């Protein structure tokens, strides 16, 4: 690995600097290097890993959507032929996106998930597995699309089962998992009713547990609850 010669602590320090500088590709490379040291990640370090790759893949997804829309318009009736360039460039961006997803999934499989025994870490990583399969599903069109969708579903489901047994209904990781799995149902699995039911049930069960929380915990949980409500408003 490119970061093999840098201390773990230095990689973490530089990931934080990269975040401050909005250098998310660098941040991701530093965090990949940190993971490859082989030690488990702390809570803070999990957040850094997430933030880095979310920003990288988020930019790729946005670009892919722009290019896909242009490509769709080119294939409309009465649209003038412009040659292979739109498809080629969409394919280039797509391949880069898939490479980032494969990188993340590789870190989770080697060996973050298998060493994660605490509920918070295991749910966090399985949620991430579901998310990155979801991103692969967004661009899939071939004979593996169904299997990619099922890989996302399976990861989310395992995370859900653990979260319901081991975490309170207000736990931010549990809430964020439910938010994202609900979006999977709506956008990927063609199951809008399941999406809506999950978001509603999650919201309501969290509402009922808010009374147990400190001011700081309340802030965290209510922020994510509002995202659930936002999606519900979009969908109903």
């Amino acid at each position: 690995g490119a970061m093999g010669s840098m201390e773990r602590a230095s990689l973490i320090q530089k990931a934080k600097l990269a975040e401050q500088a909005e250098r998310y590709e660098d941040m991701a490379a530093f965090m990949k290097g940190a993971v490859e040291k082989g030690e488990e990640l702390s809570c803070e370090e999990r957040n850094l890993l997430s933030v880095a790759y979310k920003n990288v893949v988020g930019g790729q997804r946005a670009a892919w959507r722009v290019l896909s829309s242009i490509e769709q318009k080119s294939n409309e009736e009465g649209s003038e032929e412009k040659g292979p360039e739109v498809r080629e460039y969409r394919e280039k961006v797509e391949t880069e996106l898939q490479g980032v997803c494969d990188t993340v999934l590789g870190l989770l499989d080697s060996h973050l998930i298998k060493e994660a025994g605490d509920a918070e870490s295991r749910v966090f990583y399985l949620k991430m597995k579901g998310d990155y399969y979801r991103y692969l599903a967004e661009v899939a069109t071939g004979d593996d699309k169904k299997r990619i969708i099922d890989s996302a579903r399976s990861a989310y489901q395992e995370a859900m089962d653990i979260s319901k047994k081991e975490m309170p209904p207000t736990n931010p990781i549990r809430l964020g998992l439910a938010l994202n799995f609900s979006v999977f149902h709506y956008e990927i699995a063609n199951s809008p009713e399941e999406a809506i039911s999950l978001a509603k049930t999650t919201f309501d069960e969290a509402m009922a547990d808010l009374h147990t929380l400190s001011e700081d915990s309340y802030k965290d949980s209510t922020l994510i609850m509002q995202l659930l409500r936002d999606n519900l408003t979009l969908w109903t």
Binding site: G176, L179, N180, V183, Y186, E187, I224, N231, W235
Partner: peptide, 5 residues
């Protein structure tokens, strides 16, 4: 697009 975290 819907919200995710």
């Amino acid at each position: 697009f819907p919200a995710t975290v």
